[PDB]
Amino acid sequence: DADLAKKNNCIACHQVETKVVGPALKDIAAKYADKDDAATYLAGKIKGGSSGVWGQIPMPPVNVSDADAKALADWILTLK
Ligand code: HEC
Structure with a gap:
């Protein structure tokens, strides 16, 4: 959820609605709306980097547990 993202400093680089440093969360939701295994693809980017x-700006890998990575991916997916 929104709190989980804030606590893990997602929000320092991402807004829901606009581009700050990383893409807007809702743009990510929309790009991968169709995509197979979107959630695990995203979970992996969140933990591993992108x-x-x-x-051109890379996203550093973020040190969250598997469970938080998954919940944050599932959450971004709902920002459609
Ligand atoms: C700034 C230092 C960041 C922090 C902290 C977090 N993210 Fe990020 N993110 C950032 C950039 C610069 C990019 C674009 C990288 C690229 O490949 O061009 C991203 C990208 C993402 C994505 C999409 C990855 C994809 O393959 O499409 C997701 C889902 C994402 N970021 C999520 C995310 C979350 C959940 C974070 C909190 C733990 C988080 N990011 C931190 C910059 C930064």
């Missing part, structure tokens, strides 16, 4: 999908 580079090149949205622009």
